[PDB]
Amino acid sequence: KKLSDAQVALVAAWRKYPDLRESLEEAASILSLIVFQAETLSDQANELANYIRRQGLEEAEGACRNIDIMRAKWVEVCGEVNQHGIRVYGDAID
Amino acid sequence: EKKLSDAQVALVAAWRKYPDLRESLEEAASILSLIVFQAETLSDQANELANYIRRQGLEEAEGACRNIDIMRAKWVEVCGEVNQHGIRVYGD
């Protein structure tokens, strides 16, 4: 149920069967790209929600709470990249 | 060129060819699916927030809104778009 489980399964695959490497490293590359684009948009959405709240635009606060909730759910599945460029999960996040 | 559907069938072809892989790689496929769905849920929410901003005519955040549009369009290049009949379809 974590992004890391998926990463490890791909690698385990072409470790065990090397003929799958080119293909599965391709799949890993796409999963990596998808996670990156998602986190890019999520950060932008978070910045938009900060704008809303800082401006006192309470009419949109529900959608902002939704965004908060969606980000927290995402981090559970995918963790968070720390200051050193390392993706970490749970209490390792702080 | 880099497409979600490409990733998804790479997994299926793998366990097709080596059934001992099905448990782990189908789990992997399920996680990739869940990631796409969660991202698309947030994206749609972000879109409606930009929609609200633009209906208020708030120019201060128009830049962020146009960034959202740019990101949603790049996403559809990779992951396609679900049409009204539930079929994920990729730009032609």
Residue numbers in the entry:
A (entry chain A): 3 to 96
B (entry chain B): 2 to 93
Q: Could you pull the original sentences from the published paper?
A:
We previously reported that gene 34 from Pseudomonas phage JBD5, which encodes the protein AcrE1, shows anti-CRISPR activity against the type I-E system of P. aeruginosa strain SMC4386 (4). In summary, these experiments demonstrate that AcrE1 functions by blocking the activity of Cas3 without inhibiting the DNA-binding activity of Cascade.
(c) Structural overlay of the X-ray crystal structures of the AcrE1 proteins with an N-terminal (blue) and C-terminal (red) 6×His tag reveals virtually identical structures. Thus, the unusual nature of the C-terminal sheet was not a result of the presence of the 6×His affinity purification tag fused to the C terminus. We also examined the packing of the C-terminal β-sheet within the crystal and observed no contacts that stabilize it in this position. This sheet structure appears to be stabilized by multiple interactions between residues at the base of the sheet and residues in helices 1, 2, and 3. A salt bridge is formed between E41 and R89.
